[PDB]
């Protein structure tokens, strides 16, 4: 298989420059199709300080099929379910926003920093995230609702950071 | 007077010729000018963070010879 030897490439390129932000690693070490992403919330944001801990599952496919992008921690997103799968439009099994065999890793984690920057108030996964955040954009920041629920989610990851011993940068 | 870079998703890298105060809408007004991708679709990430228009370089403090990377989106 192919797949086994494009996520070696893959693991090895995104470790040796990585996606700033984003740390991969395997889940267990000899399963190249389970990888362990550790995202950290950038400054200047309200996710700021952050510890977020996510797992994508890859075919045998790969790449010619998406592989599942699934957050461990929870998440208020518009576009995150309830499970923590995050439903970004170049995950879905069918332009540079659809999945095709071009599309890399690196393509997905970059899409993944765009979706938290924006969310895709047009697919919404979280209705009710969607729905506070779009409320949130249009008092201009006034009402903190959203803001809230993100940086007590946000707070919490400390805890995660402690147990995994991971000193947030 | 400054040269930054942007990346994109296939793998080019793309030096351009900016001002420290050159808004972010001009910035991608020469993306157009290289790639013709419309200045609608177009998102720069520096740091994390998607750079909005209606601000500055200087406002994200982007350096000389910075690497911003170029996501699409149709919206
Ligand atoms: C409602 C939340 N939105 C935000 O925080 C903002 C967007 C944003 C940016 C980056 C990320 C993000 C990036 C990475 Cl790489 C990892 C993670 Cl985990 C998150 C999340 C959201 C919009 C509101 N802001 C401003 O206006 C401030 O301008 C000075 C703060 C930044």
């Given at each position: 298989p192919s797949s086994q030897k494009a996520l070696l490439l893959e693991l090895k390129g995104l470790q040796e420059?990585?996606?700033?932000g984003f740390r991969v690693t395997l889940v267990?070490?000899?399963?190249?199709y389970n990888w362990e992403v550790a995202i950290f919330g950038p400054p200047?944001?309200?996710?700021?300080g952050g510890y977020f801990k996510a797992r994508l599952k890859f075919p045998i496919d790969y790449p010619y099929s998406p592989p599942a992008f699934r957050f461990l921690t929870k998440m208020w997103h518009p576009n995150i379910y309830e499970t923590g799968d995050v439903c970004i439009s170049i995950l879905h099994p069918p332009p540079s926003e659809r999945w095709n065999p071009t599309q890399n890793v690196r393509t997905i984690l970059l899409s993944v920093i765009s979706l938290l920057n924006?969310?895709?108030?047009?697919?919404?996964?979280n209705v009710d995230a969607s729905v506070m955040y779009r409320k949130w954009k249009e008092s201009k920041g006034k009402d903190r609702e959203y803001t809230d629920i993100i940086r007590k989610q946000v707070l919490g990851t400390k805890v995660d950071a402690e147990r995994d011993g991971v000193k947030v940068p | 007077g400054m040269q930054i870079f942007v990346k994109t998703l296939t793998g080019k890298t793309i030096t351009l010729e900016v001002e420290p105060s050159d808004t972010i809408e001009n910035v991608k007004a020469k993306i157009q000018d290289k790639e013709g991708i419309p200045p609608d679709q177009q998102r720069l990430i520096f740091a994390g963070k998607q750079l909005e228009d209606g601000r500055t370089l200087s406002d994200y403090n982007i350096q000389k010879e910075s690497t911003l990377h170029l996501v699409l989106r149709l919206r």
């Open positions: 420059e990585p996606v700033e267990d070490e000899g399963d190249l200047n944001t309200y996710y700021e924006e969310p895709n108030t047009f697919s919404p996964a | -």
